[PDB]
Amino acid sequence: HMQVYHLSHIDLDGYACQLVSKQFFKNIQCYNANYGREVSARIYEILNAIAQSKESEFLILVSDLNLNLNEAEYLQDKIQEHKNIQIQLLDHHISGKEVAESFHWYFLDTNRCATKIVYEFLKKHYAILEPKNTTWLEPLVEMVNSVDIWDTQGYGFELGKVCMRMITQSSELNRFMFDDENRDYKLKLLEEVKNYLFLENAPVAYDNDLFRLKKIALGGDPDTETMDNISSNAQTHLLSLKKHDCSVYYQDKKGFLSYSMGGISVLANLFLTQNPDFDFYIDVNAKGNVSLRANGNCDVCELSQMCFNGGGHRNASGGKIDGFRESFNYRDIKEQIEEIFNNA
Numbered sequence: 269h270m271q272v273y274h275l276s277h278i279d280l281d282g283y284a285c286q287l288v289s290k291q292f293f294k295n296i297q298c299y300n301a302n303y304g305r306e307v308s309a310r311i312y313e314i315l316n317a318i319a320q321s322k323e324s325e326f327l328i329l330v331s332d333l334n335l336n337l338n339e340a341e342y343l344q345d346k347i348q349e350h351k352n353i354q355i356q357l358l359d360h361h362i363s364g365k366e367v368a369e370s371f372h373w374y375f376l377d378t379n380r381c382a383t384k385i386v387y388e389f390l391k392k393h394y395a396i397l398e399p400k401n402t403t404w405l406e407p408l409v410e411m412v413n414s415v416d417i418w419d420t421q422g423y424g425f426e427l428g429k430v431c432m433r434m435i436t437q438s439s440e441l442n443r444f445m446f447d448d449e450n451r452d453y454k455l456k457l458l459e460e461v462k463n464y465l466f467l468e469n470a471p472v473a474y475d476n477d478l479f480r481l482k483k484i485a486l487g488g489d490p491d492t493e494t495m496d497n498i499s500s501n502a503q504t505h506l507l508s509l510k511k512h513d514c515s516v517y518y519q520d521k522k523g524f525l526s527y528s529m530g531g532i533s534v535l536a537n538l539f540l541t542q543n544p545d546f547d548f549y550i551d552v553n554a555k556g557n558v559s560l561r562a563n564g565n566c567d568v569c570e571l572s573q574m575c576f577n578g579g580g581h582r583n584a585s586g587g588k589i590d591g592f593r594e595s596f597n598y599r600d601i602k603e604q605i606e607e608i609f610n611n612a
């Protein structure tokens with residue numbers, strides 16, 4: 269029983285790598301990163317999880333990301349401190365040329381998308397869990413390859429463009445707050461393309477079916493619910509399980525703190541209705557800007573001018589945290605709110 273830790277990028281190529289890897293590994297935890305700070309955070313998370321595991325065989329798999337020399341050095345050095353740990357990086361970005369030729373585990377091929385590199389590496393070394401799936405999995409891989417390298421003649425090119433936009437626009441589950449549910453959703457949507465690959469007009473057929481499919485994958489009923497209520501309902505349900513970690517206290521009022529969620533009017537109104545014990549909702553983004561909402565039980569205009577140099581209305585307001593310190597660790601973000609609220 270070998271434990272796989274799979275870190276990948278966030279676009280179609282990045283998530284398709286993880287569709288592929290889940291076809292091979294019964295014991296796998298996935299991670300995603302966009303830019304460099306997030307990549308380092310995920311590498312720390314992965315090494316931390318491996319240090320705390322009780323298993324003995326491990327594979328660190330990194331796809332569709334390039335590391336700078338310092339992060340590649342850190343990875344190599346860290347796994348030789350105080351367990352059998354294999355590492356394989358698969359990528360196609362020419363920016364990593366120098367780093368690739370300094371590490372035997374760092375593999376660069378600029379002529380293929382990362383998903384195809386992952387597939388051929390895993391297929392050479394591991395049995396696919398369900399050998400019937402190959403008849404749709406290899407076409408799906410090739411489709412991703414064709415659009416990623418923009419081969420207008422390659423198999424599945426036009427359908428792949430639909431899938432690329434699908435991945436970009438399936439943002440109904442905030443990635444920071446709901447990392448696993450965000451990945452499951454996108455991967456469910458991408459896998460459903462297997463029911464279109466062999467249609468005569470696959471690109472258009474999938475393109476026109478996707479919206480209804482998204483509503484269903486989010487747990488909604490597309491015949492009686494709008495997308496904006498399906499998305500906010502799916503998110504609030506996931507937020508309701510986080511009440512103890514995300515609770516913050518301003519004077520005598522209790523609030524719920526989220527991060528990077530953006531436009532929160534529908535979301536917060538629904539959360540506060542379903543959870544009447546909360547007085548306000550507060551979301552912060554990476555630049556320190558703050559959105560506050562209430563349902564009559566907390567003047568968030570007064571709150572944000574006491575705490576965030578801001579203003580608005582009794583039930584909706586904004587502001588900013590000067591010197592706010594971005595992070596991919598939710599506790600780090602919460603401590604910053606707590607410190608502000610503590611003197612309030």
Ligand SMILES: [Cl-]
Nearest residue numbers: 444445510598
């Ligand atoms: Cl969280």
Ligand SMILES: [Cl-]
Nearest residue numbers: 509510511512
């Ligand atoms: Cl809870």
